Amino acid sequence: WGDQKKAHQARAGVSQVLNRLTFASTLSHLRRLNSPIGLAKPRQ
């Protein structure tokens, strides 16, 4: 996510390949959140 030459500072993990194993899996992958974390406090 960002410029091509600046991939070091570009955040990764955006725009994953859509899962199509299950209709439930598809509806799960459409409605998904993610955290920018690479300590267990934010995981709780």
């Binding site: 199509r20 194993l21 209709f23 509806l27 799960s28």
Partner: protein
């Protein structure tokens, strides 16, 4: 100031399809919500029009008898992911242990959890050179160099496979040959352990205007005894053995179970909701209506379900007398019987099997390559070699890292420790830097260590072989 619209909207898309999740344990709900995405079945209705890699579809999807009010709003009824299965919770033979299951080979022969595995490949005429071009054509035995021993007669004159034919492992499936700067066979090959059937193939033009094609190979997967299965409650299991109908137990009315799950899957990973599912499934299949199993309902508990089942002519706790399939004698305990929803998981026994014997070898490491797709070999890690250090088997641990992985012979001087050149035919062993032609010693030592010490010598470091 506000009221909840309904208490069961807490769950997400995956967690909604679990009925009675309050009766389960939260780690098991988490596991099944993670595994609900792996449950195959029909996924998108135009699956034959579409084609993409790693697509699964199942013969007979069934909406669950035990259902909640929210999977109907996720359109799970239209596109289910499993079959309601008559399940005996029993320790029948011993093949159910460690959460495993016994399935009915008679049912499996009737289409129970049988599925179709669609796979697709694609190739392009990516023209790079002026005359270095690849053209879809049938390769001739002598005009091109990249030969294997596969059957090349299955293709037509266009250079593509005919639909509907049978292809086995290591077969040519698209024939493309690139011309030399006469030609070189740069054709793609079907990957090992497939034995599939081609179904539908198309030709078209890509974004950059040249020819481009896709195929689609389908293979039915009769469930072997390795396939991964789970319920809607976190009931991870693999198929232990497939008995026939005459070998498994049977009720007084003739009901034989489809899947037998071990009774010790219940007490440790507390999945009482699976038992409630089974009871409500029995009463729903006996009654006719579809069971209401919303997560939070004070009008539905175990007592009313038990009374409804007892009204219909069964044991009020869901048990049922079974007879031994082999002996014919009555089982002393009374097995808990009833339909419930299981799912078939993506993880196949045929896709996970792998064997290696001195096959393809990595260009850099001179070692086995990285996994089954490349026909590589298994890793033997640090903690593995430490296991032999604990055992004290030094020569097994030597054979596992030197003789079988990458044996190699080097020539090194005896005055210095620097690796020396050696001509094999003319036998002129001579070490540069010492003018030594009489003391070079053969050393058997791995190629990984040779490349290691050559990377050190690229860093102006001198690892010297003091063999004396």
């Amino acid at each position: 100031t506000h009221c909840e619209i309904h208490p069961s909207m807490i769950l997400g898309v995956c967690a909604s399809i679990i009925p009675f999740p309050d009766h389960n344990q939260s780690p098991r709900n988490t596991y099944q919500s993670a595994m609900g995405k792996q449950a195959m079945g029909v996924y998108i209705t135009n699956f034959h029009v579409r084609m993409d890699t790693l697509a699964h579809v199942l013969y007979y999807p069934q909406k669950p008898l035990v259902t909640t009010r929210s999977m109907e709003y996720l359109r799970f009824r239209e596109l289910p992911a499993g079959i309601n299965s008559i399940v005996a919770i029993a320790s029948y033979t011993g093949y159910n242990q460690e959460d495993s299951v016994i399935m009915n080979r008679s049912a499996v022969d009737r289409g129970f959890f049988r599925s179709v595995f669609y796979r697709s490949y694609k190739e392009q005429e990516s023209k790079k050179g002026f005359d270095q071009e690849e053209v879809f054509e049938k390769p001739t035995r002598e005009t091109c160099q990249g030969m294997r021993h596969a059957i090349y007669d299955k293709l037509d004159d266009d250079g593509l496979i005919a639909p509907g034919v049978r292809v086995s492992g290591d077969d040519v499936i698209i024939g493309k040959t690139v011309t030399l700067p006469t030609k070189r066979d740069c054709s793609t090959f079907l990957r090992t352990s497939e034995t599939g059937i081609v179904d539908q193939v198309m030709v078209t033009l890509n974004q950059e205007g040249y020819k481009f094609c896709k195929i689609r190979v389908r293979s039915v997967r009769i469930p072997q005894i390795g396939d991964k299965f789970a319920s809607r409650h976190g009931q991870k299991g693999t198929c232990g053995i497939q008995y026939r109908q005459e070998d498994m137990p049977f009720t007084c009315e003739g009901i034989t179970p489809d899947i037998i799950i071990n009774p010790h899957a219940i007490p440790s990973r507390m999945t009482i909701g699976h038992l409630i599912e089974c009871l409500q499934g029995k009463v729903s299949a006996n009654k006719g209506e579809i069971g209401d199993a919303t997560p939070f309902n004070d009008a539905v508990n175990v007592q009313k379900i038990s009374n409804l089942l007892s009204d219909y002519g069964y044991h009020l706790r869901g048990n049922e007398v079974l007879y031994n399939g082999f002996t014919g004698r009555k089982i002393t305990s009374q097995i808990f019987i009833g339909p419930t929803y299981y799912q078939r998981l993506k993880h196949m026994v045929d896709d996970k099997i792998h064997s290696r014997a001195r096959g393809p070898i990595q260009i850099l490491n001179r070692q086995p390559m990285e996994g089954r797709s490349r026909d590589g070999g298994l890793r033997f890690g640090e903690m593995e070699r430490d296991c032999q250090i604990a055992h004290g088997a030094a020569q097994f641990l030597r054979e596992r890292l030197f003789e079988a992985s990458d044996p190699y012979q080097v020539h090194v001087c005896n005055l210095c420790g620097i690796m020396a050149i050696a001509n094999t035919r003319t036998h002129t062993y001579e070490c540069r830097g010492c003018r030594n032609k009489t003391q070079i010693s053969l050393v058997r030592m791995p190629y990984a260590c040779k490349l290691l010490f050559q990377e050190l010598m690229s860093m102006s470091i001198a690892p010297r072989m003091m063999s004396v």
